[PDB]
Nucleic acid binder design. Structure first.
Lengths: 84, 89, 85
DNA sequence: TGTCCTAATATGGACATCCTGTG
DNA sequence: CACAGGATGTCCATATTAGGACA
């Protein structure tokens, strides 16, 4: 009645520069929440890396996988992938 | 209609009419699936799972192994046993 | 009452039960990978997810440009190096 | 991002489904 | 076969998310 509720949106790239962003920031906090829940609950190594259109890179990495994004050998391979 | 295998199985072991299908093979919990496939047939009717059979039912039984409810009996075919019997009742 | 208890809220700590834990690991890993895809495609962004089973399987989702990080020699050794110290 | 309202989902628990492997 | 044990899906019922609109 009041609000339309959570709309069932199509799993296709959002085109409205604004919405997209709004979604991006929400799902991001959410998925990271998950990587933490999954990590924690089952105590399993987990690595999560997300990079926004700006290029800002966000990550979650359990104790052991940390090197994957801290070391220079890794921090390198990454910048390297986000290219062409 | 909330029922679990071990409940259902027991429910069959308390009805005489079901003695040549499933019967106690001891007084301290051990029991045998004489007509295994049939029990399965019925159990898939209790859960509304048409394509049910012993190869799927037993798998539930094996899961019960580690959950410390129903253990197999090495050697004896189709023979299992409740581990907390007659406590379970 | 109802047929099942439905979804039940759990403490957010480590699961001591090897089976409840194992079951939960699948259920989740099944969904997190989904989210990764969604976010990835929903906002057209690169996403690298990397889940390591308690046993040994390493499930992973990665967008095209990131693929070279779980498909490349260096990545594989690096990922591999990151799991035995 | 931070809520609110509200529908869309994710997913605990209990098996069901497939499957690989074994004497 | 008859039995073990693993990964993933299903069904019920409810615990968590996240589209819109607006700050």
């Amino acid at each position: 009645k009041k609000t339309r509720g959570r709309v069932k949106i199509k799993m296709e790239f959002i085109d409205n520069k604004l919405r997209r962003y709004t979604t991006f920031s929400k799902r991001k906090t959410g998925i990271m929440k998950k990587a933490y829940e999954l990590s924690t609950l089952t105590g399993t190594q987990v690595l999560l890396l997300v990079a926004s259109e700006t290029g800002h890179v966000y990550t979650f990495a359990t104790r052991k996988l940390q090197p994957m994004i801290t070391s220079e050998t890794g921090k390198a391979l990454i910048q390297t992938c986000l290219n062409s | 209609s909330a029922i679990t295998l071990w409940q259902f199985l027991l429910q069959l072991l308390q009805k005489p009419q079901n003695k040549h299908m499933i019967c106690w093979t001891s007084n301290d919990g051990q029991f045998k699936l004489l007509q295994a496939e049939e029990v399965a047939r019925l159990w898939g009717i209790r859960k509304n799972k048409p394509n049910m059979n012993y190869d799927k039912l037993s798998r539930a039984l094996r899961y019960y192994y580690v959950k410390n409810i129903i253990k197999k009996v090495n050697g004896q075919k189709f023979v299992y046993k409740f581990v907390s019997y007659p406590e379970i009742l």
